[PDB]
Amino acid sequence: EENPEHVEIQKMMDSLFLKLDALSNFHFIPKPPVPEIKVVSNLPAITMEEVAPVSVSDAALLAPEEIKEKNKAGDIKTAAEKTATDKKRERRKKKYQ
Amino acid sequence: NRWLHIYDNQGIELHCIRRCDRVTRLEFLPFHFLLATASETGFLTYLDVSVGKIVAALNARAGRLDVMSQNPYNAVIHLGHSNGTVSLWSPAMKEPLAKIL
C-alpha cells in the first residue's frame, strides 16, 4: 500500500496544472475524463491496452543473461585447475577490493 | 437543456441556477414567491425567488417527472405518473400529501 494523503495531493496538483495550461494553449485540447472514485466490479475484466504482442510468450521477453549470470571471462575454472598466475590474479583483485 | 436560467424582459441574463438541472416543467406560486421545478432525474425542487435560496428538494421516487400543475386555491403541486396516479406535494413534507388513482 501507499500513503493515502500523498495520493490526493498529487491528484489536486494534476487538476490544477491542467487548468493553468488550458489558458496558455493556442488551440483547444479536450480534457480526458477522470473517475472521481473507481469501483472494482465483481465480474472478470479484460484490458484494451496490450504491452506485448499477443503471440509472444513470457519466455521471449527474458534476455538470456537474465536467467544465467556471466562472469567477464565467460568460463568457469575450479580450484584444482587454477595455475599460479590465476591464483596470483585473484589475490591481487581481493587486495584491490 | 442543462440548467435553469433567469432573464430580464429586455433579454439580459440574471441568474443561472446550477442545482436545478434537466428540468422539464416549471410553475410559479405567486403569493408565496416560490418557483417549482420538475426534473428528468425524478426530483421536485422549490426555489424562493424573494431571497434566492432553495427551500426544499424532494425526491418523488416515481421515475421521470413530466406532468405538473398547481392548485391556485390550495397552492399544492399535482404530479402525474405512468402508474395512473396523481400525487399531491408540499415543500414541508418529504412524502406526498396524497395519492389518488
Binding site: 519466455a59 527474458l62 534476455a63 538470456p64 536467467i67 544465467k68 | -
Partner: protein, 60 residues
C-alpha cells in the same frame, strides 16, 4: 559448438525418459534453451551470407 557437439550425442543416444532421471536436468534445461536460440539465429544469418558466393559464381 563443442558444447552442442556433446549435447547432440546425449539427445540421440539414450532414451528421453532416462534424461528426466538425471539430477539437475531441470535447472540445466533452463539455461540451455535461450542461449541455444541465439546460436541458431546467428547460424541462420551465416547461411544467408553464404549465398553471396553463389552470386559470384554466375558472374564469372
Amino acid at each position: 559448438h563443442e558444447a552442442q557437439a556433446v549435447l547432440g550425442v546425449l539427445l540421440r543416444r539414450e532414451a528421453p525418459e532416462e534424461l528426466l532421471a538425471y539430477e539437475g536436468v531441470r535447472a540445466a534445461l533452463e539455461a540451455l534453451l535461450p542461449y541455444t536460440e541465439r546460436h541458431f539465429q546467428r547460424l541462420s544469418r551465416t547461411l544467408q551470407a553464404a549465398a553471396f558466393l553463389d552470386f559470384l559464381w554466375h558472374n564469372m
